[PDB]
Subunit: 324 residues, 3 copies
């Protein structure tokens, strides 16, 4: 019956043994000095409770019933400073303190390998309003599209999480998040030759960011009306000016000028080029008129049905879905 | 004196031994192939540094001095896709990518067992504005109440954390969070028989969500004035219409019409049904009047003290605590 | 050649052995009852895959290639209730459910030791609007300054993360975050002797919080115009009143009165004491005028260039960069 030697009081050992494994039935304790290790291993095969150190990935993984290998007790963020570079590849599980004090920069998300793959960035210096961070999903999509995205709010922090290839990276956690920007086209470029109050574009744009010598200008500092950008204050000669059309991406949770403030007169219909959500009120020559009293507005048609005929040389201003 | 056999150069072993434990005083190393395991165990008793694999819970726990058993190096999020179901039980420590593309859905929070028990959800498809997610604390309260809560902002992500039974689940982490809704009553139900510009309610409601064929309508598309909801645009015949009273729950960080725009005349007192926070201004027939100049308003009394007598057939509009 | 005793079928042991380590080449398994331990150790020296229990820190650390010792599978949050105290030291890696139901309180961030050191707080009771939480970076700076910060939004949750000493603690994760306050000066103190509609300050302040018997008053309840605070409603005699100047700190993502509503007449220039971002419109005696039609405004100069001479006894109100 007995398969192997039996040591009823156990055994002491005074140098390192070389043991091909054991089923243990008692307490594994340690003494001062006792160092202890996990085996190196990069393989998919495993059994629940098996634990390892991954030398490739530098992560202590255990092998969980459903989903095999994974980091021990879920995961957590590995913070590091990021040298300001024009471009930087990030790794799953890290967090990057970004310093855009010097200018804009780009980070490139890693190839996703698992649902829940995560990368955290942070405007540690509060500089993204003026020097946006561009985030690149490489060829995989971000919010259902492969378009790069820029974060133009300073002090914003954000965890990107892989939802799978259909919607791709989505932000699961963050602070400070306003409108993401998806820049479509650099629709104006110019080394300004004189002091510049305004510039005219080749096309009326939807909505634009403006960049002076690679520094994003705040929306308070310029105004886009039709196809002219006006600059308050002006910009000096020699300035590297860029205008960039973009599509907003909403994370967190409007005035119309008719005929340059000139009233055609005896008209009941105003048509707004943009289909508008709502028109609560219209200011006429410093007098406010309210919807379903002074006027009727049809949303699909974008047509304001005026109650009475206009006079000649009146000033008309429209409020569009404002602080409802 | 010697208690057991001594092996001064250690021992080699060529098959698995069967060892009832040992105090180890040297380096436990491994060779290629070396697999290593933690013991299975679901018990409360433990000693600091004891480590285990929990087979019930599928989590690698260590036993920490204060609070015994816990996940190794705190925790972290276990992401998984969630099949769109009308209802779904979630587990502590998981995160759920939700797909509400097809319609609304409900998730039910687990029984809490420990302070800091956490569950993460995510509108991965940006669909909660139109197909809200309802979150259920089962019988335990959420923000101090056992009422279910709905998230109607798309692209929102949110970690719910157990604070104990008094306040219950609270969101500790998230992105996109606007107003939670706590639906009190389905105050109107109807299969519409004609095209519908408006509907009258059995009661004037405080604030309402509207649902057409189980899809939540945006606040831009309808207006609730007194006890009539008006619809811009209209809704087709056959539509499954629902109106739902709810109480907001504020996470992140207003016009009054008097006598249907008809002035009674020679009056100095306007009373606002809702007690109002503040009344900066009143528009009278397209002329704005400012508080503590044109008028005096008392907040508890909700009474606007007009400086001069009203004329007959004037239009009066009040601004209530607007963009201060 | 043979260095030590060879046991070709392994060995059984019936009591605890005392082994000075081994290179293991096979499966370490366990039986029911098998308890297993990591060695205690608080030292910087280590080799990749070495694992330990830290008795000082109560954390199960592994030794990662780059950065040696660290919590196993990154980290995660250790939630605990916080006894309401006037002041409380927090520990790295914990999260604190705060109860400010009873009144304001202060938490003090720990000495940072590693980039990514993190502490989470949470207004579990939704009480910070009325009883702000003050956060102290001790002598280290927070957002580049050593000034304490107060959170006055209820239901806010927030993780503070060490970015290194230059910018110091930054919030990397959170919910509900509005304007941080950095209180500079208690610029008014008084036990009120009568019912109080208003109080006059020794200095015109920029922006102020107000506290009645240690409870922060909501901005709806009082108004600061020039150097007079007006109170709507009033405050009872015996009230412990405090006014506090502060500088906002923006995380998430305006009316000017000229000569007390009295028009000097025949003037084209209005100068605004604060340099203003933008002035879209000016209300004159209940008539709105729009920028670049009715008027021209220069931002650096803060000068409104009126088109026509003022009349005597007119009312002028200015809109400053409002809901653009």
């Amino acid at each position: 019956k007995p398969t192997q030697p039996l040591f009823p009081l156990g055994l002491e050992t005074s140098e390192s043994s070389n043991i091909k494994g054991f089923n243990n039935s008692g307490t594994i304790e340690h003494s001062p000095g006792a160092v202890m290790t996990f085996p190196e291993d990069t393989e998919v095969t495993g059994l629940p409770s098996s634990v390892r150190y991954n030398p490739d990935s530098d992560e202590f993984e255990g092998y969980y019933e459903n989903g095999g290998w994974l980091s021990l007790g879920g995961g957590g963020i590995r913070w590091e400073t990021l040298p300001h570079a024009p471009s930087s590849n990030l790794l799953e599980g890290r967090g990057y303190l970004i310093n855009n004090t010097t200018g804009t920069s780009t980070v490139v998300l890693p190839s996703p390998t698992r649902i829940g793959d995560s990368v955290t960035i942070c405007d540690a210096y509060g500089k993204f309003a003026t020097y946006p961070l561009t985030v690149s999903p490489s060829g995989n999509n971000l919010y259902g599209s492969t378009e790069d995205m820029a974060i133009t709010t300073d002090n914003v922090s954000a965890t990107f999480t892989w939802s799978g290839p259909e919607q791709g990276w989505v932000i699961t956690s963050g602070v400070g998040l306003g409108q993401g920007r998806v820049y479509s086209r650099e629709i104006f470029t110019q080394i300004l030759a004189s002091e510049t109050s305004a510039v005219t574009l080749n096309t009326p744009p939807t909505i634009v960011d403006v960049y002076a010598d690679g520094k994003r200008l705040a929306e308070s500092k310029y105004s886009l009306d039709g196809n002219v950008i006006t600059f308050s204050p002006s910009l000096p000669a020699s300035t590297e000016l860029q205008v960039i059309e973009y599509t907003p991406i909403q994370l967190g949770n409007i005035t119309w000028v008719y005929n340059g403030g000139s009233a055609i007169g005896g008209e009941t219909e105003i048509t707004l080029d943009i289909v508008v959500d709502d028109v609560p009120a219209i200011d006429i020559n410093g007098s406010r008129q309210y919807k379903n009293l002074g006027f009727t507005f049809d949303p699909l048609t974008s047509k304001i049905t005026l109650a009475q005929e206009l006079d000649a040389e009146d000033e008309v201003v429209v409020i569009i879905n404002g602080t409802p």
